[PDB]
Amino acid sequence: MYVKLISSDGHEFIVKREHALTSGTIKAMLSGPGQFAENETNEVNFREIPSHVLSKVCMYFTYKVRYTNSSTEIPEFPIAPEIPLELLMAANFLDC
Amino acid sequence: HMDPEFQAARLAKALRELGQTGWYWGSMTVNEAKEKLKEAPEGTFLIRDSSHSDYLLTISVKTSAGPTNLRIEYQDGKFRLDSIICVKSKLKQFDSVVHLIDYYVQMCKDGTVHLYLTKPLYTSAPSLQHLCRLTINKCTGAIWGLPLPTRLKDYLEEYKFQV
Amino acid sequence: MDVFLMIRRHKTTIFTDAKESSTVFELKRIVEGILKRPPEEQRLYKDDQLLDDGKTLGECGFTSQTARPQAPATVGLAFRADDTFEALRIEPFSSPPELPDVMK
Amino acid sequence: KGSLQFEDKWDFMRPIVLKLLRQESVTKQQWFDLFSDVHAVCLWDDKGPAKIHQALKEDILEFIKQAQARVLSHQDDTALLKAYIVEWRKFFTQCDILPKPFCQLEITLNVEDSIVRKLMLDTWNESIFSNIKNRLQDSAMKLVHAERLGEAFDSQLVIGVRESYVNLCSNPEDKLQIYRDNFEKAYLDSTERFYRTQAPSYLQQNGVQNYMKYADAKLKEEEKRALRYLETRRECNSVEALMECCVNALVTSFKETILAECQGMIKRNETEKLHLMFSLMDKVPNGIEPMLKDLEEHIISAGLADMVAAAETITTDSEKYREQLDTLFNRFSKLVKEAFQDDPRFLTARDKAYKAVVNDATIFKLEV
Structure with missing residues (x-):
């Protein structure tokens, strides 16, 4: 099951729901008046997060959920110095 | 600075922030340390408990001859690498065990076997916020001159190391 | 053994994963369950090249160390009209703002 | 920016x-x-x-x-x-x-x-609360007292009051303080009080054996509602305090008048009724200590009564002797299972009583 995360500039991002939920903020937004039907597709809209930031955020969710040191590949999540402050704001907001 | 109670403080503290990095692997056995690093690249290390009474932390790192283990000694209120290791650096004594690891990681990453300290093995996926921090601390050391909220600048102040 | 993809279309991006040995067809079945569209109405591109339904994702260039979670491999997706497929058109993400002099 | x-x-x-x-x-x-x-x-x-x-x-x-x-x-x-x-x-x-x-x-x-x-x-x-709380409480207790007399209302009324006392307590180191000292206590008292007069009346109007049928169906509903009305989501074991109350009201204060029918029911092998009595007296402390006696005392009594009364044949054969003890042991173990559900305490009761009959039916005896 997936959820749709839309950026400020109209970009939709579809990620596994359990992955997207590593964020408390998102869980909160999908509750209360943000609650969704039982079989309706979940969709959240961020108004202050651009696509080049929100896409990286989604990458983080996967990076996290599949984190493993016992692999033939040693985990790593490099961030471009030109999108960190904008990503720091996004992470402080999503809380993760 | 050299004092019985002052050294116990400096330690207890530097040992506190150590568990705030993610490279502390608790009571990881030696074989397990070998498993993790066995195939890792030269310079990949991690910190764990020493089954010895004179020192508290051990550094497991991958070298030319494979994974190795070596102390992190504390005396006269300063943290230094193992005695055995022939060290050639402008600085050999630090206050925080984390300050030590950082300095060397910057130098090394940038007499038989060679010894490097480059990539620490994180016990679990760090927070995105922290990775951003680590990323920013690598770019500059002048935080406040940035276009960030006065509070996030505070978050970047609670950890100044590049790893 | 796992390749981390990033399938894209008109301002639509799907972050998902499959086996380096699974086939291109199976990937379309994944896209099917996500965008409710049959495999015969799909066109998967990679570096602007139509992917063969029989080749494994590995035989196409996706590998365990080139398709990592931190940076997924891009896969182009073009749908079908009533007869002819649309042209593979992917929207670019917003550009990253200039780097503050301090961080250079 | x-x-x-x-x-x-x-x-x-x-x-x-x-x-x-x-x-x-x-x-x-x-x-x-x-x-x-x-x-x-x-x-x-x-x-x-x-x-x-x-x-x-x-x-x-x-x-x-x-x-x-x-x-x-x-x-x-x-x-x-x-x-x-x-x-x-x-x-x-x-x-x-x-x-x-x-x-x-x-x-x-x-x-x-x-x-x-x-x-x-x-x-x-x-x-809103701090002031009209008391008026809400006593107004809520009324609704409950009503439900006991057959009057059904919107249960959400007493609950809303409970939720209020539980969730609206400004005490820094105790959140159920005003819940216990007020709502709970109120519920306990209106309950105990209700029966302090309700119970005795039904006992004198029906049989003590009809009362046990009542004091049981009561403990059942009082515990079912006490689950919807009192706090349960939190850990306070309030529902327990209420039961101890119903038990000390519907049973503990009527034990002597209940256990007085113990020896009589046990004689007519009224397993149905003894099952009921066990169910209740098992809730009260030292509740079945007397039943364990009224049993091992009936065994010893009725056991040696079966032997002596049949001695006419039992004395002639060593096997007609054993058969008699066997017929009994099977008869009592029958009771114990049926009535007292084989409670390990009641088996020990039999095993000691029966083991007693065996050493008191001894007919023959020789010596140097």
């Missing part, structure tokens, strides 16, 4: 805060957009968080006084509650919702330990 402060956003934000408080439909885009605004205001505005706390404090007060009016506008006690429970249902529900968007406010000054959620409940206590 163009600075956006409190005064810049609050005007677009506030309208939603009001809708949330009043439980008026808010669109998902507004829900989301709010989280974003709260966050922005907090990190970008120097005094941003501090103000949002003030603004909320105010707007929460207004709504409450609006509800205060709507509630207190009733003189009649039955309507004062009915009106409270309605305004409560809403507000209490919105307490788990309104705080959500302001979690960044917490870290600058969890949804349960929420400053906002706290400020919500507290402001509601000072304006």
Whole structure:
């Protein structure tokens, strides 16, 4: 099951729901008046997060959920110095 | 600075922030340390408990001859690498065990076997916020001159190391 | 053994994963369950090249160390009209703002 | 970047805060957009968080006084509650919702330990509960006392009162304080009191064997409702305190008059009725100590009565002797299983009583 995360500039991002939920903020937004039907597709809209930031955020969710040191590949999540402050704001907001 | 109670403080503290990095692997056995690093690249290390009474932390790192283990000694209120290791650096004594690891990681990453300290093995996926921090601390050391909220600048102040 | 993809279309991006040995067809079945569209109405591109339904994702260039979670491999997706497929058109993400002099 | 402060956003934000408080439909885009605004205001505005706390404090007060009016506008006690429970249902529900968007406010000054959620409940206590609470309680107990006399009402009325006492307690190191000292205690007393007169009356009108049938169906319903009305989600074991009460009222004070029918029922092998008696006397401390005697005393008694009465044949054969003891052991173990459900304590009872009969039926004896 997936959820749709839309950026400020109209970009939709579809990620596994359990992955997207590593964020408390998102869980909160999908509750209360943000609650969704039982079989309706979940969709959240961020108004202050651009696509080049929100896409990286989604990458983080996967990076996290599949984190493993016992692999033939040693985990790593490099961030471009030109999108960190904008990503720091996004992470402080999503809380993760 | 050299004092019985002052050294116990400096330690207890530097040992506190150590568990705030993610490279502390608790009571990881030696074989397990070998498993993790066995195939890792030269310079990949991690910190764990020493089954010895004179020192508290051990550094497991991958070298030319494979994974190795070596102390992190504390005396006269300063943290230094193992005695055995022939060290050639402008600085050999630090206050925080984390300050030590950082300095060397910057130098090394940038007499038989060679010894490097480059990539620490994180016990679990760090927070995105922290990775951003680590990323920013690598770019500059002048935080406040940035276009960030006065509070996030505070978050970047609670950890100044590049790893 | 796992390749981390990033399938894209008109301002639509799907972050998902499959086996380096699974086939291109199976990937379309994944896209099917996500965008409710049959495999015969799909066109998967990679570096602007139509992917063969029989080749494994590995035989196409996706590998365990080139398709990592931190940076997924891009896969182009073009749908079908009533007869002819649309042209593979992917929207670019917003550009990253200039780097503050301090961080250079 | 163009600075956006409190005064810049609050005007677009506030309208939603009001809708949330009043439980008026808010669109998902507004829900989301709010989280974003709260966050922005907090990190970008120097005094941003501090103000949002003030603004909320105010707007929460207004709504409450609006509800205060709507509630207190009733003189009649039955309507004062009915009106409270309605305004409560809403507000209490919105307490788990309104705080959500302001979690960044917490870290600058969890949804349960929420400053906002706290400020919500507290402001509601000072304006509506703290005063008309007592009137609600005694008004709620009435509804319960009614249900016991066959009058069914909107159960959500006494519950709303419970939820109020449980959730609206300003005690820093004890949250069920006013729940125990007030609501619980009230429920316990109106209960014990109810039976202190209700029980004895049914005992003198029906049989002591009919009463056990009653004191049982009672303990059953009193425990079923005590589960919906008293606190259970939290850990207090209040439901237990109520039962100990019903048991000390419906059974402990009637044990001697109950156990007086023990030896009689055990003789007519009234397993059905003894099963019932065991079920109850098992709840009271030292409750079955006397049944364990009235049994091993009946065995010894009835056992040697079976032997001596049949001695005419038993004395001639060593096997007609054993058969008699066997017929008995099988007969008593029969009782024990059927009536006393083979309780390990009742088996020990038999095993000791029977083992006694064996050494008292001894007919033959030779010596040097």
